[PDB]
Amino acid sequence: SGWTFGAGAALQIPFAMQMAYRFNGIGVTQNVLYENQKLIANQFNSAIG
Amino acid sequence: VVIGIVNNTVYDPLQPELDSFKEELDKYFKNHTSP
């Protein structure tokens, strides 16, 4: 649900697209996420390991 | 490269600019070329 479950009813949303919101709030356009979707997973998976 | 993309069409605001004028000009062209 991203973060909407904190503010009101929980609303489902795909996780592969939720990062577009988080990246948008940082100050980076959404186009960097999908075009680096495969790569950004590897950095996250390695970091969490 | 983008995953999950889907096909669709996007309506440009310039599309009516050419739909309502160029054909009208073409109508004027036919009003001008035919005689």
Next chain:
Amino acid sequence: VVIGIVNNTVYDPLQPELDSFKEELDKYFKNHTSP
């Protein structure tokens, strides 16, 4: 008035698209003036 400014040309997302119809309209005028 602003300091540090430089010269360059700001591309227009309208004129070349409009000149594309100018490439058609003016050619149509030449398509009718010459004959």
